[PDB]
Scaffold this active site. Structure first.
Site, PDB file in Angstrom:
ATOM      1  N   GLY A  59     -25.992  19.819 -28.290  1.00  0.00           N
ATOM      2  CA  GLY A  59     -26.863  20.869 -27.817  1.00  0.00           C
ATOM      3  C   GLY A  59     -26.173  22.089 -27.256  1.00  0.00           C
ATOM      4  CB  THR A  60     -27.829  25.222 -26.247  1.00  0.00           C
ATOM      5  OG1 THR A  60     -28.029  26.079 -27.379  1.00  0.00           O
ATOM      6  CG2 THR A  60     -27.787  25.982 -24.953  1.00  0.00           C
ATOM      7  CB  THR A  61     -22.855  25.428 -23.461  1.00  0.00           C
ATOM      8  OG1 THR A  61     -22.455  25.958 -22.192  1.00  0.00           O
ATOM      9  CG2 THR A  61     -22.575  26.406 -24.533  1.00  0.00           C
ATOM     10  CD  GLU A 120     -24.633  28.766 -26.903  1.00  0.00           C
ATOM     11  OE1 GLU A 120     -24.320  27.680 -26.393  1.00  0.00           O
ATOM     12  OE2 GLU A 120     -24.165  29.143 -27.988  1.00  0.00           O
ATOM     13  CB  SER A 140     -27.467  20.882 -22.903  1.00  0.00           C
ATOM     14  OG  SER A 140     -27.106  22.083 -22.251  1.00  0.00           O
TER      15      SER A 140
END
Ligand SMILES: [Mg+2]
Ligand SMILES: [Mg+2]
Ligand SMILES: [Mg+2]
Ligand SMILES: [Mg+2]
Ligand SMILES: [Mg+2]
Lengths: 244, 250, 243, 111, 244, 242, 233, 205, 241
Positions: free
Chosen positions: A30-32, A47, A75
């Site tokens: 996943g996204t940070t 993000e 995330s």
């Protein structure tokens, strides 16, 4: 034999709960998102990947507020995060209803923790596929926490999770070493924006959108507010500045 | 979420064997030895205190438990399973008998109640059987003295003497020779001590053995005076010193 | 048939593997603890290891204040440890409301052990991978240490140790008690017992400790508390004179 | 003791012509001897060319009208936008009212 | 999920047989034989004890013959504990009927009800069946002396003489050989004992290995008398018949 | 094993697809919609000659203005018919009017995916999908004559003509070619009869096939054997020409 | 490998995937295409309807949820019925209790949470349908894309279903143009049809084929089927 | 109030002062005109420095206090020391939510380091009112005038003990349902002090 | 709590549990029913795996559901009891609410309905039973005979048989029963039935039990002897040739 990883609550021969470990893999894909604790508050940033130009800018908000003083970002599997926040909200409300005071951050953390851990106790449920960074301000200071799929959580000075977690934690360790005095919320906002931009390199193939929020005793009154307008652009610029 | 295990975990295998019950009985076989001997004026149940460390305080772990003032139990198998079976037995003694008839249940019936609890763990949904076998000794007005063994299946049987656990085969053999129907309680305590000595590996004394009898009424253990119909509990755990005094007359 | 290693049912040898695997999880944290009883106190020492420089040291603890009188040290993953702490706190409060007196350390242990026994028998519940050491200075029993495990076993101790290096600590303590002949440290102040404790942990593990490497809980009549870094340091600074 | 009912006054009148129909109602809302409002509409357009008034205890009147207008909304949903005819609206309202047969809506309704 | 661990105790085999029932009947075939023989003036129930010893208290024992009523008794073949569960529900049903109608419960009604309970464990619920087979010996004003039998499937049938447990084929053959419609109880006793003696898997038929009962309508009275033989009485009747 | 509400790697619910296979083993049923009525015909298919054919109910009245034919595990439809009938009557009670045919259909199709083992969403107890398809035909004022095909998947389509059952691929092909916006009730009856005649294993007579229709004027009527024999005869003749 | 990790939604794979959910996402991919796009005044849904034979109707793809919101579906229709019903109820409750029109952002949030519950518990099964939700609330025009995994996204335009990627590209190109079609409903629709006609292949969109829906400023959610879409081919 | 149950009658008050807060109460309970207990303790501890004065039904207030004591013990174990405002809220929740079956007028007084002394009165309906001082019990009607005339904010311990002592003696003087001894509980940073004043002292003032 | 789907569709569109239930029926004693012009006769073979039975008490194979309707079956004896009891209750419930006893089709539709429910409800397995239900509707004289199977499917028959070897005896009825002259007498109806059972039972008097049901609640079970008289007369219209 084998098969210790097909059902949730099963202990492997070496004491691990494999299903919880695979959940962590969903979080790493996943996204940070990060959290930075400051001299009198916390800043959260995440993000947001722009899958395409068709996404309406600034509308798919990911950071969430619980009660009026807690911010939560996560995330992994976004829906699971929303599920955890919905529970967080029910729990915060219950607390305020019976005790009148808004839920202390250490109390709230444990509430999230016990619920997540509960999902590692039976094979009829799947563990949460998210790591949540959250915190806010209470009767005695700011608090930042990060919660893992196992239900494990601890307090942080800075926290990062997602694909770029390592660069982030790297950049985060830099801040904690240089500024032991603390960091002003203003600087933390700037620094968070930086850390996300830098962390963004661990996923440099898609364009992105920055989202920041904070809860500070001096800048937001101990209430959670998203970083919008002037404040946000100043941090974006400072970020595209310290990149080269 | 929720106990969706509403099905049996013990089922019949093609040979007519109830797997989980056979395996529970194997668990009982690896447990410390416990025995019980029935005399003319008493019953003695005994077991060894297999302390799993010398830093542990062996007295805080009773393997011989009082169920009612005239009934006691000992076991061989999984200790925690026995502990919960004792709580349930002490309670049912009240719920299915004292609160209805104003008196404690007779041994056979209390035995029958524990047995039912064990049988249900053999058929109800989502549970495994109890990994223990118990020896329950007691007395009651109309039946006198009795000793019963209860197995993981829920089957129970009355004995003159018996032994369960690790060396139960050898011990059941020593008991068959020594037992006769003219034994006074002191003689049974004696034979119990002898039988146990053979199963016991190391130090054999009053701090590594646990013995209790069901004998005469003990007014000094009642706690009050004034009511003549209730004369005191017949169950009495022998103290560390009472055992030693008898070990010296070996 | 072969799933006998996934849920709590007997293996053909009469073993419950899930319980056994729960015992291995208790060692996943690589933290050791020990507890000793004084003349009128009970002390528990547990190592504190904070790896990540990003963590707030003040929140990393495996010692819990269960009630005004009972303290509990957990050897096992933090989420299971906290699941147990919460239940223990609830059980202790409920007991006081219902029975009119404070729940004894030994009774709390028996209760927590009974709950553990249940996870051992019912297939839907997984055992918790933790060992619980409960300490207090009981109003009837005096200083007390009762430890419960994933098999639902519990017993009281003269002193005890738990963790990956349990054996070294245990043999050390065992030797001290065979040498002194009593079931407790013969010191009047809890501060000296705490010192005794830290000393023996150092002698046993062959390791030196700073103030941020230890975690200490003390139980005295009517209260159980945890020592601060600074109180521990004063203990450390007092020990660096016998050695 | 708590009395769950009240009387808000009012009078309504419905007259059916050959190719039209009127439903009129005064506009005053009262409680005992006081005027609560000089203009509080009591006759409503429910959609589908149906007008309705549930006169008596106003809380119950507001509730029934709210429920009926909703019934019309769901009728369209559940029956491909079909128009609810007056005879159908009527049978439907009988069911709404009788639904509370043992704790009635203290109203006299006219559509 | 949990489906994984379900043995599915209530399914049909490709041949239309009930697995668990068939396997329970197999378990039963290893239990001591129980025999019931119906005469013109009484019924006999005889049973061989399983798992004995010199130390077992035979006096205070009962593992095969149980009184369900003053006019009904059963002989058990199978798991003693499962049998006690059912026996107690039968004892209660008998008393429920007496309370409702003020007449003793007719034998078949009790038998049918018990069987229906067994059948239930066969079609729904997901629990293993009861590993027990019963021989019911009883009397009532409508049909007089009766003898029935029920097995794990829940099917029950009536007999003039029957056996359950180990070596049924052999025992039934011997019974069908020496049985005569006009038998007297004294004669039935001998046959039951003779039959066990020739089918026992053990050395010799001794008193300590038996349980014996008769239900007779002693002509010098009126009420039907159920007599559970005591050890010494079994020793006595074993001599008169000639097995020593 | 594997769950009852599990999706396949193609995105199809296993139990629903398999359900569809049980339907391919059932008697053929055909419905044809005209502007004077909708005809529903079915192949009786007795398993032996000792069976009294009139007791084979594969065409049932749902309400005066709605009838239906079934194909597949016919016993499964009994609860479906019960629901449909209750829905129509109930609608009349609540609204003093006839229930629209689409609505009746949709109500029946809502039952379809209500199967599973504690499928988190609502309470759906039915261990498996239905193993029967239905042809629902009727008339209502807003959309006139309609014929619907209700499947165990919950989806239903409106059709000008439709065949279901064993001879469906063949039968549907004939229907595709013979149907036109101006068929007469009599022509429809004939087609149904003809096409049933083609796909059936046995020789079609008035005792192993059944016709019915639904008209605005007379509602749903199951044609008695005599009316059909005449129609069959009228077919033998029309075919024996060119 | 797979039949070990894809039997229930309650099982995570070794790489952290939820196979039952991914299989659900596939049913959507075999559904007929539907496009959604919006300007600052209206939001349109255009949908290609599919039939079974040439003797049947074309299954509806658009569902009205309230006067100011509606959606187009792709995939398992019974499921869209279940979810649009929920949306209808949630819209209704907002009006009844708060006399407030449910915000699209909120409708999306509600849909996501309903879908998620079906992905974390055993015995259940994910929903197997995708939805494009358009509406006009207090903050203007909106288009949202819902996927069974529980992921709901707000967009300017989009499409889902087989060959959706074509129209998705046309929209992605035409953005600057359609986002400005204010006050001209018919144009927006035409852009939607142009978009949808880029995902065709089989046949040409006819009068029995197309379905369009529009909502906006002074336009209550309204569905144009057959007869009334003639002017847009 | 149920027919025949024990009533607290009472003259109770809690007064905040410079150093903290003091609770006071009489010690009489009645069943009609009979004094069931002439030396009751109406000053109840729900937490170390959070106490309450009870009035109304003796059974109800004991039941409620027993439950608040429990809720606060569990709160403490999990989140640390509770505020007086939190203790008042727990009391309120119970009184308000069960208003149909309880007769309890409770005054909650407590001491904190951040907030100093605080007083919350929870009257019959279950409403909560934070005040500088509060009086309740059946004997309170008689001292409304006296108390409003003599109370001053920030008094000293000596002065507050006197104020409470004079007020309650008057309350006890006129109300038959009040009598016995005057008990007080002083709550400050220093700790908890228990005071008791006998008739012979307060009666002639 | 137990609700596992035991009856489910397998890849080819079959429900094994229901199909396996049928196999249980195939193993049960044979039952046959044939109808005359004013009667229906139900014949059943007696399980001969074991013998020494008390014929007085043993659950009869043909059961009265009411004074005018009977049910026989082939399959699991224990399961039959559940169906029979439900049927008998519904029979009394119908008299209580409709003020008229059940028709035979109604009773059949009820039993069949129960059978079907057990094929698509969680946690239960189908009944391993097929039934023959016969009798006369109230105030009517036309005989009725229906058959139900595990799937819950039901229909009426001029003559039918179920159970072991039914395929065989079904073949006997298919070419010995003529709907133009259905057994115009109790006597000839019984004979045809016995004839059919004789083609399977293998020379056994006591091996066959016959139940004759006539209009207006007149149901009688012929005695061992009354039937033997038939087998004898039958071994004549076979030996004279
Ligand atoms: Mg980590
Ligand atoms: Mg378990
Ligand atoms: Mg489990
Ligand atoms: Mg109408
Ligand atoms: Mg006074």
């Amino acid at each position: 034999g084998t098969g210790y990883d097909l059902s949730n609550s099963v202990f492997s021969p070496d004491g691990r709960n494999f299903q919880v470990e695979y959940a962590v893999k969903a979080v790493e894909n996943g996204t940070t998102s990060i959290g930075i604790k400051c001299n009198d508050g916390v800043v959260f940033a995440v993000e947001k990947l722009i899958t395409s130009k068709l996404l309406v800018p600034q509308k798919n908000v990911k950071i969430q507020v619980v009660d009026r003083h807690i911010g939560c970002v996560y995330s992994g599997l976004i829906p699971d995060g929303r599920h955890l926040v919905n529970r967080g909200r029910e729990e915060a409300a219950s607390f305020k209803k019976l005790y009148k005071t808004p839920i202390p951050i250490p109390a709230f953390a444990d509430r999230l923790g016990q619920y997540v851990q509960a999902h590692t106790l039976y094979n009829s449920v799947r563990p949460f596929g998210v790591s949540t960074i959250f915190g806010g301000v209470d009767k005695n200071g700011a608090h930042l926490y990060m919660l893992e799929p196992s239900g494990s959580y601890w307090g942080y000075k800075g926290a990062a999770t997602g694909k770029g977690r390592q660069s982030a934690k790297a950049e985060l360790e830099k801040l904690v070493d240089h500024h032991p005095e603390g960091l002003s919320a203003r600087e933390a906002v700037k620094q968070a924006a930086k850390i996300i931009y830098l962390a963004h390199e661990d996923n440099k193939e898609k364009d992105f959108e920055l989202e920041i929020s904070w809860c500070s005793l001096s800048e937001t009154n101990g209430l959670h507010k998203f970083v919008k307008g002037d404040l946000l652009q100043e941090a974006i610029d400072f970020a595209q500045k310290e990149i080269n | 979420m929720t106990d969706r295990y509403s099905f049996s975990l013990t089922t019949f295998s093609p040979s007519g064997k109830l797997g989980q019950i056979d395996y529970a009985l194997t668990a009982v076989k690896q447990g410390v030895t416990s025995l019980g001997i029935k005399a003319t004026n008493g019953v003695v149940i005994a077991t060894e205190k297999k302390s799993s460390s010398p830093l542990a305080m062996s007295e805080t772990l009773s393997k011989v438990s009082l169920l009612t003032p005239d009934i006691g139990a000992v076991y061989s198998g999984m200790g925690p399973d026995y502990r919960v079976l004792v709580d349930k037995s002490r309670k049912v003694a009240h719920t299915s008998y004292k609160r209805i008839y104003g008196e404690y249940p007779p041994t056979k019936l209390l035995v029958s109640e524990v047995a039912k609890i064990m049988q249900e763990a053999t058929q109800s949904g989502g549970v495994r059987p109890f990994g223990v076998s118990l020896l329950i000794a007691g007395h009651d007005e109309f039946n006198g003295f009795s000793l019963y063994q209860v197995d993981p299946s829920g089957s129970y049987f009355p004995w003159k003497a018996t032994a369960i656990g690790k060396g139960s085969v050898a011990a059941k053999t020593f008991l068959e020779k020594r037992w006769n129907d003219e034994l006074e309680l002191e003689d049974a305590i004696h034979i119990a001590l002898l039988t146990l000595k053979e199963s016991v590996e190391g130090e054999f004394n009053g701090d590594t053995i646990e013995l209790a009898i069901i004998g005469d009424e003990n007014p000094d253990l009642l706690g009050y005076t004034g009511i003549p119909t209730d004369k005191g509990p017949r169950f009495r755990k022998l103290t560390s010193q009472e055992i030693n005094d008898r070990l010296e007359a070996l | 048939a072969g799933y006998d290693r996934h849920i709590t049912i007997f293996s053909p040898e009469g073993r419950l593997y899930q319980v056994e695997y729960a015992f291995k999880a208790t060692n996943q944290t690589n933290i050791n603890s020990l507890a000793v009883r004084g003349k009128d106190c009970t002390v528990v020492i547990s190592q504190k290891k904070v790896p990540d420089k990003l963590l707030d040291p003040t929140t990393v603890s495996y010692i819990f204040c269960i009630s005004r009188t009972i303290g509990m040290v957990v050897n096992g993953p933090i989420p299971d440890a906290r699941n147990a702490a919460l239940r223990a706190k609830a059980e202790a409060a409920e007991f006081r409301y219902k029975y009119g007196y404070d729940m004894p350390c030994d009774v709390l242990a028996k209760r927590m052990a009974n709950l553990s026994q249940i996870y051992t028998q019912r297939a839907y519940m997984r055992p918790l991978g933790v060992i619980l050491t409960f300490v207090s200075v009981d109003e009837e029993l005096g200083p007390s240490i009762y430890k419960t495990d994933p098999a639902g076993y519990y017993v009281g101790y003269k002193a005890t140790a738990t963790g990956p290096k349990q054996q070294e600590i245990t043999t050390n303590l065992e030797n001290h008690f065979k040498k002194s002949k009593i079931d407790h440290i013969n010191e009047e102040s809890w501060e000296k017992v705490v010192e005794f404790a830290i000393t023996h942990m150092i002698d046993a593990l062959g390791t030196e400790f700073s103030k941020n490497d230890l975690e200490v809980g003390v139980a005295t009549k009517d209260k159980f508390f945890t020592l601060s870094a600074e109180n521990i340091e004063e203990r450390l600074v007092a020990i660096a004179e016998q050695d | 003791q708590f009395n769950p009912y009240g009387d808000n006054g009012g009078t309504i009148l419905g007259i059916a012509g050959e190719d039209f129909a009127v439903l009129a109602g005064d506009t005053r809302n009262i409680t005992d001897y006081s005027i609560n409002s000089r203009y509080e509409p009591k006759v409503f357009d429910c959609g589908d060319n149906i007008v309705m008034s549930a006169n008596g205890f106003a809380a119950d009147g507001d509730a029934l009208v709210k429920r009926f207008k909703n019934s019309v909304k769901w009728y369209h949903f559940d029956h491909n936008d079909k128009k609810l005819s007056i005879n159908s609206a009527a049978r439907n309202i009988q069911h709404l009212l009788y639904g509370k047969r043992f704790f009635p809506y203290y109203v006299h309704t006219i559509i | 999920g949990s489906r994984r661990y379900d043995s599915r105790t209530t399914i049909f085999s490709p041949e239309g047989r009930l697995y668990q029932v068939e396997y329970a009947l197999e378990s039963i075939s290893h239990a001591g034989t129980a025999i019931g023989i119906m005469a013109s003036d009484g019924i006999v129930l005889a049973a061989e004890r399983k798992v004995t010893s010199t130390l077992l208290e035979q006096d205070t024992s009962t593992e095969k013959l149980y009184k369900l009523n003053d006019k009904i008794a059963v002989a058990v073949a199978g798991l003693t504990a499962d049998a006690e569960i059912l026996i107690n529900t039968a004892r209660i049903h008998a008393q429920n009927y007496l309370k409702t109608y003020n007449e003793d419960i007719p034998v078949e009604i009790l038998v049918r009800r018990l069987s229906d309970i067994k059948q239930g464990y066969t079609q729904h619920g997901g629990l293993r069946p009861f590993g027990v087979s019963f021989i019911y010996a009883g009397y009532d004003d409508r049909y007089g002396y009766q003898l029935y039998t029920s097995n794990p499937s829940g099917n029950y049938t009536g007999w003039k003489a029957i056996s359950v447990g180990a070596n049924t084929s052999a025992a039934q053959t011997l019974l069908q050989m020496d049985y005569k419609d006009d038998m007297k109880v004294d004669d039935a006793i001998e046959l039951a004992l003779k039959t066990l003696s020739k089918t026992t898997d053990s050395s010799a038929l001794t008193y300590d290995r038996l349980e014996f009962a008769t239900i007779r309508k002693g002509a010098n009275d009126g009420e039907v008398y159920q007599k559970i033989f005591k050890p010494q009485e079994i020793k006595d009747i074993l001599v008169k018949t000639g097995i020593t | 094993d594997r769950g009852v509400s599990t999706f396949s790697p193609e995105g199809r619910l296993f139990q629903v697809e398999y359900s569809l296979e049980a339907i391919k083993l059932g008697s053929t049923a055909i419905g044809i919609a005209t502007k004077e009525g909708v005809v529903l015909g079915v192949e009786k298919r007795a398993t032996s000659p000792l069976l009294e054919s009139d007791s084979i109910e594969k065409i049932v009245e749902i309400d005066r203005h709605i009838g239906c034919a079934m194909s597949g595990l016919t016993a499964d439809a009994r609860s479906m018919i019960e629901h449909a009938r209750t829905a129509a009557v109930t609608h009349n009670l609540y609204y003093d009017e006839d229930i629209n045919v689409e609505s009746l259909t949709q109500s029946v199709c809502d039952l379809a995916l209500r199967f599973g083992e504690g499928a988190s969403g609502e309470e759906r107890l039915m261990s498996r999908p239905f193993g029967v398809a239905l042809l629902i035909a009727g008339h209502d004022a807003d959309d006139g004559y309609q014929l619907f095909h209700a499947e165990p998947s919950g989806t239903f389509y409106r059709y000008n003509a439709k065949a279901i059952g064993s001879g469906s691929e063949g039968a549907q092909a004939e229907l595709l070619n013979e149907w036109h916006s101006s068929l007469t009730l009599k022509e429809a009856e004939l087609l149904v009869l003809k096409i049933l005649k083609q796909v059936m294993e046995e020789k079609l007579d008035e005792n192993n096939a059944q016709l019915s229709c639904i008209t605005k004027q007379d509602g749903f009527k199951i044609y008695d054997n005599e009316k059909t024999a005449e129609l069959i005869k009228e077919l033998k003749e029309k075919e024996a020409a060119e | 490998f797979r039949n070990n990790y894809d039997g229930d939604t309650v099982t995570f794979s070794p790489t952290g995937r939820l196979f039952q959910v991914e299989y659900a996402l596939e049913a959507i991919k075999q559904g007929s295409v539907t496009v959604g796009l919006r300007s600052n005044t209206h939001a349109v849904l255009v949908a290609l309807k599919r039939n079974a034979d040439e003797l049947s109707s074309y299954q509806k793809k658009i569902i009205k949820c309230d006067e100011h919101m509606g959606l187009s579906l792709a995939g398992l229709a019974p499921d869209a019925r279940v979810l649009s019903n929920y949306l209808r109820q949630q819209c209704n409750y907002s009006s009844l209790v708060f006399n407030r029109k449910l915000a699209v952002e909120r409708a999306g949030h509600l849909l996501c949470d309903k879908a998620q519950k079906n992905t974390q518990s055993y015995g259940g099964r994910p929903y197997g349908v995708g939805l494009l939700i358009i509406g006009y609330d207090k903050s203007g025009a909106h288009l949202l894309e819902f996927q069974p995994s529980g992921n709901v996204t707000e967009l300017y335009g989009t499409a889902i279903g087989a060959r959706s990627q074509g129209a998705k590209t046309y929209l992605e190109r035409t953005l600057d143009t359609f986002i400005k079609i204010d006050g001209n409903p018919d144009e927006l629709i035409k852009a939607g049809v142009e978009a949808i006609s880029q995902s065709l292949r089989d046949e040409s969109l006819t009068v029995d084929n197309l379905s369009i829906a529009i909502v906006g400023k002074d336009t209550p959610f309204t569905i144009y089927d057959g007869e009334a879409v003639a002017k847009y081919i | 109030l149920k027919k025949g149950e024990v009533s607290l009658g009472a003259s109770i008050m809690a007064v905040t002062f410079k150093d903290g807060v003091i609770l006071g109460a009489d010690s009489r309970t009645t069943t009609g005109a009979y004094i069931a207990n002439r030396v009751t303790d109406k000053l109840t501890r729900v937490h170390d420095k959070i106490w309450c004065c009870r009035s109304g039904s003796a059974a109800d207030t004991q039941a409620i206090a027993d439950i608040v004591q429990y809720h606060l013990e569990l709160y403490t174990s999990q989140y640390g020391t509770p505020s007086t405002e939190t203790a008042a809220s727990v009391f309120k929740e119970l009184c308000y939510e069960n208003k149909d079956n309880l007769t309890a007028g409770i005054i909650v007084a407590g001491y904190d380091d951040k907030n100093k002394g605080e007083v919350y009165t929870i009257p019959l309906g279950g409403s909560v009112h934070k005040l500088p001082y509060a009086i309740a019990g059946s004997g309170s009607t008689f001292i409304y005038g006296y108390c409003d005339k003599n109370f001053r904010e920030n008094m000293s311990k000596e002065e507050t003990v006197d104020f409470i002592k004079h007020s309650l003696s008057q309350a006890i003087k006129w109300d038959g349902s009040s009598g016995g001894v005057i008990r007080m509980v002083v709550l400050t940073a220093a700790g908890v002090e228990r005071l008791i004043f006998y008739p012979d002292e307060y009666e002639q003032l | 709590g137990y609700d596992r789907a035991l009856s489910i569709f397998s890849p080819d569109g079959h429900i094994f549990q229901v199909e396996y239930a049928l196999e249980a029926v195939k193993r049960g004693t044979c039952a046959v029913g044939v109808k005359g012009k004013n009667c229906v006769v139900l014949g059943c073979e007696r399980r001969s795996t074991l013998k020494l039975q008390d014929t007085r008490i043993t659950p009869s194979k043909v059961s009265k559901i009411d004074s005018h309707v009977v049910l026989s079956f082939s399959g699991l004896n224990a399961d039959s009891r559940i169906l029979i009891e439900k049927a008998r209750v519904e029979a009394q419930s119908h008299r209580l609410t409709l003020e008229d006893p059940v028709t035979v089709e109604y009773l059949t539709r009820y039993v069949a309905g129960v059978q079907q429910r057990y094929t698509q409800s969680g946690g239960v397995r189908p009944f391993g039973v097929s039934t023959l239900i016969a009798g006369f509707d109230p105030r009517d004289d036309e005989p009725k005979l229906y058959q139900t199977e595990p799937s819950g499917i039901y229909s009426s028959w001029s003559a039918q048989t179920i159970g072991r070897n039914s395929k065989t005896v079904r073949e006997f009825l298919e070419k010995n029963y003529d709907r133009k002259e259905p057994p115009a007498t109790v006597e000839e109806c019984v004979k045809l039935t016995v004839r059919s059972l004789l083609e399977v039972v293998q020379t056994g008097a006591k091996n066959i039990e016959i139940t004759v049901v006539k209009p207006d609640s007149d149901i009688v079970a012929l005695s061992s002897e009354e039937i033997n008289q038939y087998v004898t007369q039958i071994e004549q219209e076979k030996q004279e040739q």
